[PDB]
Structure 1
């Protein structure tokens, strides 16, 4: 009876195994755009992905992960609200069963069809496992997806999904350029939060871009053909793998714009 996204084991249950679920800096949150404070001291976000080395794509039973070589400063995030430098380790998405839901963060209560999370760890802590034990260990760049025109830079991801249909499948995934997943603008909101998945550790500086990307109905439908189950088990479609908005508590969301 492990955690997941169902009636039986979903977000409302997670606190029993992970009591930090009811903590002071949980994610995601609703971004109230009128209440977010413009902070003129925030810097532009520096996204340096030209040397990124993707390795592999994995169905981990909850979503799919595109993993990168993070054994040197290749692909890094810095600037914005961050001190020092954060290395890209992986990205993944959360998405819905319907185009009207799927994102984890919301904007004035609006849900997007999906949300991309690019996960980075603070190189001062040496490895990802040490970083997640620190309040400033991770920086996650979140990007909303709306359904409209296709995102050409997503199609390589879309096209490999049939090879990792079920939990625990993995495929070589080299030479993928994550720059093709970014919107035009790097304007952002930021706040201190958590992993949105168990173990829900309060280690993340969230940076959520204002501008969504557009993906086609066909691209998101292929996400929804993935399976949460392993091969040889009954099919349960990988949809609605998002945590809802959590209480903001004693936090301020800052805007770079």
Structure 2
């Protein structure tokens, strides 16, 4: 199955999910001179309940913090969105070097990593799985990480990693104040796109914050010590898990600010 190693990595995904070569694929290059300021975009309306976080797991592809998405305690509204998008899960993408780890790239700057906050449209769809197949179904908030001072909220995640080193492992994780993890400015870019992992469905309204948050180099390096292999299989490390930028194909990237 798919991964980020030589034989199964991004350049091969098109062979086994042809929508990899679709018209609305993510991530992208964000060219700030090409983006259009749009006065109809709204500020983000963000409500994240720290008690919504329940479990952290290693998928083999990243870690995932799963939130209880039974009801509307944690939702994203506003921004480019119509209606209410329910928080489902948080995960991270990084590279082998601090030099180049994010998925979206801004005027050629990669960041050290990129956090994705995944939400689904419960005002139109009954479940995440249904929403994931529709153009208006999902909203992802992307937040860049740059190397700087250690991040006390991220230290809570890094403290769990030894317990989920193998693919498939999980452990309880709650009291996670996602709202306080976001940067001071919520100015953003937005465009229509896709999941950045198989199945690569073109169901995502991307919301990428301009301002990065900081992480230390030692905290970021802990993520690379997760395995992409399960207990009992020959070990291989998830040292890098970001997809390259994909063609814009005529989409409009809009800015909430100017």
**Equivalents in 2 of 1:178, 1:238: separation in Å?**
24
> TM-score, normalised to structure 1's length?
0.98
The number of residue pairs the alignment matches comes to 256
Supply the distance in 1 between the matched residues of 2:239 and 2:86 (Cα, whole angstroms): 29
Q: Contact 1:152–1:180 (CA<8 Å) still a contact in 2?
A: no
How far the C-alpha of 1:253 sits from its partner, in A, is 0.4
Q: Deviations over 1:90-113 (max 9, x none)?
A: 000000110011110000111111
> What secondary structure is seen at the aligned counterpart in 2 of 1:20?
helix
Q: Could you say which residue in structure 1 is the equivalent of 2:142?
A: 142
CA distance in structure 2 between the partners assigned to 1:48 and 1:192 by the alignment:
23
Give the aligned partner of residue 15 of structure 1: 14
Aligned to 2:211: 211
CA RMSD after TM alignment: 0.9
Q: Corresponding residue for 1:119?
A: 118
- Between 4-13 and 223-232, the greater mean CA deviation after superposition: 223-232
| 1:89 aligned onto 2:88 | yes
Q: Which residue of 1 aligns with 2:152?
A: 152
Higher mean displacement: 176-185 or 31-40 = 176-185
Distance of 1:118 and 1:52 partners within structure 2: 16
3-state SS in 1 of match to 2:248: coil
Of residues 197-206 and 220-229 in structure 1, the stretch that sits farther from structure 2 once superposed is: 220-229
Structure 1's consecutive aligned runs of 4 or more residues displaced over 6 angstroms after TM superposition are: none
Mapped contact 2:103–2:114 kept (Cα < 8 A)? yes
Question: 5 Å matches for 1:1-257?
Answer: 2-50=1-49, 52-123=51-122, 124-257=124-257
1:236 deviates by 1.4
> Unpaired segments of 5 or more residues in structure 1?
none
